[PDB]
A paper describes a structure:
Resistance nodulation and cell division (RND) efflux pumps are secondary active antiporters that are ubiquitous across all domains of life. During drug efflux, AcrB undergoes a functional rotation where each of the three protomers sequentially cycles through the conformational states loose (L), tight (T) and open (O). Substrates can enter the PD through several channels and bind to the access pocket (AP) in the L state and the deep binding pocket (DBP) in the T state.
To elucidate the conformation of AcrB without the crystallisation bias, we assessed the structure of the variants by cryo-EM. In contrast, V612F and V612W mainly showed particles in the T state (72.7 % and 83.9 %, respectively), with these variants displaying trimers predominantly in the TTO (54.9 % V612F, 44.1 % V612W) and TTT (31.8 % V612F, 53.8 % V612W) states. F/W612 appears to stabilise an open DBP even in the absence of a substrate, as the bulky side chain might mimic the binding of a small substrate. Moreover, the proximity of the bulky aromatic side chains in the hydrophobic cluster might introduce a steric hindrance for the rearrangements associated with the closing of the DBP required for the O and L state formations. Indeed, our structural models of the best resolved O monomer densities show that the DBP remains partially open in V612F/W structure.
Residue numbers in the entry: 1 to 1033
Write the structure that this text describes.
């Protein structure tokens, strides 16, 4: 095949140029992100039953929808929750790779079956099916620099001028708004209402009558009378536009002719639609947009558009308005991508340096160095062809490939150089002679190396998505490398090299190379003699191998396990949960202390704090709060004590002293889509109908057990809410009939005053906005305020609520949760420092087994993927080993040689296990990729010996011992040079400590340690395996 391109070297260069420009074109157009779409798609169903308690909401809404949701294709698990506000959120998670649009359609089809069974007010409120994720792409905060506008004043400007543009910006999927659009608030006062003998029903009726839009037809409309000469529309009542217009709404006229206006009985002002959530930025009033990335969109492309969009509305800002970015993932993505690119460049330079040590020639070492850019760019073109995107996982693939793809070009020039030393043949004739001895070695090594990475691409789950990224990159690199080796290297070796005199071994040089060559040759002779002695006593060394295999198995079970390493993303969360029934003011007091601590004790690291009051991952509630914490640039946070893991440990330690509040600081998970916090996600399931009371006791019992193991479990907490006291008011309808008061009036008066009521819409600066009627704050705070409200009887009298009602206190859960249709309570926690999530996973299962019968458990979120990854790990190795064995046999149709080759696999695996154990790493997704790389690399070193040894017997007729000793003698230098090229190739990953180094260290350490033992042990045991196996068969 090289002979087709030796005659026409221009054709070889033309081929290389095409691959070069194909990669360059691909780079300029490929999408860029940190990770691919590896998180499983999720669909969220949102419904509302205003005013109903959590237990009532669950029975009439959640159960109705859930019972129809079974039987949906590719459904992994389903979870739901309902709270005291009447909100319903049912989340369905599908298998990874499932089409989100098809899944959303199927969910929407099933919803129509349960839609008629829901309450009418639920149907009128509207139930929405939406593709959802728990991770924000970025958070764009808006603050006022002089404090002249309140939170709702800021929120409306964001809602009116920004939300519409942002929500329809390219690639934007969802926009949560931290605040509310302006709404006309009618703060009624019961005392003046009672003075004029009015009721909230009268206020609502008057607003609807006087604030309405009425169609009135046209003048001379069709069919017109003959001779009509004018056509014009008639304009009836229109929506009110100002608070003054609302203020002078006429309610009733007194007997003396006086007019009772709306402003005489209520305060009229522009306020928010709801006041449940309060957001502050560094202790300053603020709002913002919780932008979420659409499924299938690019993180970098959308954020650049969003930042460009924000600069567009900047000229239209009111005075004092400022934009801030408390949360932004793009700086982390860019810095992580660049570090691997920096690592990639260092690998090429180091690979160039080590080869120059051996070849000691500028021109000779340049020929194989030219190959690397061609194939490296070629992998980019293959990525574009298959529809992949540039990411850290693909970035790691080329970095790992660096030690592999150069091996084919390394050994070719070695043979050509060796031919010159042995015979002084001209470079073109030496090149032609070289191929006939080497072609099998090049394809065989490339074929088996690509073979081991093929089965990994066929596995499912989020782990399989990670595996595919390494699969496409490495396999395509190997395929292109052997293509380039046959295409490009023979041409330059025949044109760009220079002859080396026959018999030249380089011992006579005066430079450092002279010392290196003489020492290298002398050490080789001693090594060969040692191998010869070993081959005479192979019985001893078989026992050593069996010890190694036993040791490898012992280390594999001793090594802890995990899913994915944590990273310093520059941001972390702190959650605050006050006891049951805590008001909004009390939670704000705790959040002020939390914000004050970060800005004083951690002013060196914390850039800004963005806190919410009334909202959290445990659900909406005045007693729940959460705060984003933004850290400075990684360049400005040197050392380990300034990292997220250290900061959160100190923050949690300090916040433990805070009384009457539970505060936890945690890092974000490895990927933000699969969960809200790092650690394990544990679900406790009632599988027999134990009820809420018994299930809560089991949850408390489990938490007590976890609290007794602080050495391996930390920050163990429930994700739900404790049972809150409830104010129950009973309306005696029999007394209502006696007093002559309509029941609907009683319900309307109670609902509108205390819970607030949405009447209709109004126009505010050309935008449609809601109108709300509610009691003033000071008249709806205590149970004694119930008697302050009156209902007008049919006879015209005013009667208070106390004359026909009674009140009492009850207890009930403010939030109920279900898992897969069964009642459940969610438990969160983290592994103690030094331990791993897998150990926490193992311990939690043991503790859960002690719970009373009828209570089960299941893992979800990150933990579910953690469990799934471990389960299919044995199948990944078993299939990969089988594939390589069959692939090796295909080269010879003999079983002895592939069996001899696979005997070195434990020699490499033990190196990866030892390296991980000494550094304290864990068996995770990255480590599993390292093992498969080590398996291929260990076989590759063996092939360099077996292939040569096999030829010397079948082609030159040398003896078994003679061929093995001879083939080992020449092949030591290619093995050492290729092994070292891999050692320094992945060394930057091992020594990396910057941003994103957690992933790099996990990948680099396993392959580096494995390759060391795959080189030191192999050069002795591989001759033992080959000799013994061929002696037996």
């Amino acid at each position: 095949m090289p002979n087709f391109f030796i005659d026409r070297p221009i054709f070889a260069w033309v081929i290389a140029i095409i691959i070069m420009l194909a990669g360059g074109l691909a780079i300029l157009k490929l999408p860029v992100a940190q990770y691919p779409t590896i998180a499983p798609p999720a669909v969220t169903i949102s419904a509302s039953y205003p005013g109903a308690d959590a237990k009532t909401v669950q029975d009439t809404v959640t159960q109705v929808i859930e019972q129809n949701m079974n039987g949906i294709d590719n459904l992994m698990y389903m979870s739901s929750n309902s709270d005291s506000t009447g909100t319903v959120q049912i989340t369905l998670t599908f298998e990874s790779g499932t089409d989100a649009d098809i899944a959303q359609v199927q969910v929407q089809n099933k919803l129509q079956l349960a839609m008629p069974l829901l309450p009418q007010e639920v149907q009128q409120q509207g139930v929405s099916v939406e593709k959802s994720s728990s991770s924000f792409l970025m958070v764009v905060g808006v603050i006022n620099t002089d404090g002249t506008m309140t939170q709702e004043d800021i929120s409306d400007y964001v809602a009116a001028n920004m939300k519409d543009a942002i929500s329809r910006t390219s690639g934007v999927g969802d926009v949560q708004l931290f605040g509310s659009q302006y709404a006309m608030r009618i703060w009624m006062n019961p005392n003046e209402l009672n003075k004029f003998q009015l009721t909230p029903v009268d206020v609502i009726t008057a607003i609807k009558a006087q604030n309405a839009q009425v169609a009135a037809g046209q003048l001379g409309g069709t069919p017109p009378v003959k001779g009509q000469q004018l056509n014009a529309s008639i304009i009836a009542q229109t929506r009110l536009t100002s608070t003054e217009e609302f203020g002078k709404i006429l309610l009733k006229v007194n007997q003396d002719g006086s007019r009772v206006l709306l402003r005489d009985v209520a305060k009229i002002e522009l306020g928010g639609e709801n006041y449940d959530i309060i957001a502050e930025f560094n202790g300053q009033p603020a709002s913002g947009l919780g932008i979420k990335l659409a499924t299938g969109a690019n993180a970098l492309d959308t954020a650049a558009a969003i930042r460009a969009e924000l600069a567009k509305m900047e000229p239209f800002f009111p005075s004092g308005l400022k934009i801030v970015y408390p949360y932004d993932t793009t700086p982390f993505v860019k810095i992580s991508i660049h570090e691997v690119v920096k690592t990639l460049v260092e690998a090429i330079i180091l690979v160039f340096l080590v080869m120059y040590l051996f070849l000691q020639n500028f021109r000779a070492t340049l020929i194989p160095t030219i190959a690397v850019p061609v194939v490296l760019l070629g992998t980019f073109a293959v990525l574009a062809a298959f529809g992949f995107s540039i990411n850290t996982l693909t970035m790691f693939g080329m970095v790992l490939a660096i030690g592999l793809l150069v091996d084919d070009a390394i050994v070719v020039v070695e043979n050509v150089e060796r031919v010159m030393a042995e015979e002084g043949l001209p470079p073109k004739e030496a090149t032609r002679k070289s191929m006939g001895q080497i072609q099998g070695a090049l394809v065989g090594i490339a074929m088996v190396l690509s073979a081991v990475f093929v089965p990994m691409a066929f596995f499912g789950g989020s782990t399989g998505a990670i595996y595919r990224q390494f699969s496409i990159t490495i396999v395509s690199a190997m395929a292109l490398s052997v293509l380039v080796a046959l295409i490009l290297t023979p041409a330059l070796c025949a044109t760009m090299l220079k002859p080396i005199a026959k018999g030249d071994h380089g011992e006579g040089k005066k430079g450092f190379f002279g010392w290196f060559n003489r020492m290298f040759e002398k050490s080789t002779h001693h090594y060969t003699d040692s191998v010869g002695g070993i081959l005479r006593s192979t019985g001893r060394y078989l026992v050593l191998y069996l010890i190694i295999v036993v040791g490898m198995a012992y280390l594999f079970v001793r090594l802890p396990s995990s899913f994915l390493p944590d990273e310093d993303q520059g941001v972390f969360m702190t959650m605050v949960q006050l006891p049951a029934g805590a008001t909004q003011e009390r939670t704000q007091k705790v959040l002020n202390e939390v914000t004050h601590y970060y800005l004083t004790k951690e002013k060196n690291n914390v850039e800004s704090v963005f806190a919410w009051n009334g909202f959290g991952f445990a659900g909406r509630g005045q007693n729940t709060g959460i705060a984003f914490v933004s850290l400075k640039d990684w360049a400005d946070r040197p050392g380990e004590e300034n990292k997220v893991e250290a900061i959160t440990m100190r923050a949690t330690r300090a916040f433990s002293q805070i009384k009457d509040a539970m505060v936890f600081a945690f890092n974000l998970p490895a990927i933000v889509e699969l969960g809200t916090a790092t650690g394990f996600d544990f679900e406790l399931i009632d599988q027999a109908g134990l009820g809420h009371e018994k299930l809560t006791q089991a949850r408390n019992q489990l938490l007590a057990e976890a609290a007794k193991h602080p050495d391996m479990l930390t920050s163990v907490r429930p994700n739900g809410l404790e049972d809150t006291p409830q104010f129950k008011i009973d309306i005696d309808q029999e007394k209502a009939q006696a007093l002559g008061v309509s029941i609907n009036d009683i319900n309307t008066t109670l609902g509108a005053a205390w819970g607030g009521s949405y009447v209709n819409d109004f126009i505010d600066r050309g935008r449609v906005k809601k109108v709300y009627v509610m009691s003033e704050a000071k008249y709806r705070m205590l149970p004694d305020d119930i008697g302050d409200w009156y209902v007008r009887a049919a006879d015209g009298q005013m009667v208070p609520f106390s004359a026909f009602s009674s009140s009492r206190w009850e207890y009930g859960s403010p939030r109920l949760e279900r898992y897969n249709g069964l009642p459940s309570m969610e438990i969160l926690g983290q592994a103690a420092p030094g331990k791993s999530t897998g150990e926490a996973m193992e311990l939690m299962e043991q503790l859960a087994s002690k719970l009373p019968t009828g209570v089960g458990y299941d893992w979800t979120g990150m933990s579910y993927q953690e469990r799934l990854s471990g389960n299919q790990a044995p199948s990944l190795y078993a299939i990969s080993l089988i594939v390589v064995f069959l692939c090796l046999a295909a080269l010879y149709e003999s079983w002895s040689i592939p069996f001899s080759v696979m005997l070195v696999v434990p020699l490499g695996v033990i190196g990866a296990l030892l390296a991980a154990t000494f550094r304290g790493l864990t068996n995770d997704v990255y480590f599993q990729v390292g093992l498969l790389t080590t398996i291929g690399l260990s076989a590759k070193n063996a092939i360099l010996i077996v292939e040569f040894a096999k030829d010397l017997m079948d082609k030159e007729g040398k003896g078994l011992i003679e061929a093995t000793l001879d083939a080992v003698r020449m092949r030591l230098r290619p093995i050492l040079m290729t092994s070292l090229a891999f050692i320094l190739g992945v060394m930057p990953l091992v020594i990396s400590t910057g941003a994103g180094s957690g992933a790099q260290n996990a990948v680099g350490t396993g392959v580096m340690g494995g390759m060391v033992t795959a080189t030191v042990l192999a050069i002795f045991f591989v001759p033992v395996f080959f000799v013994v196996v061929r002696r037996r068969f």
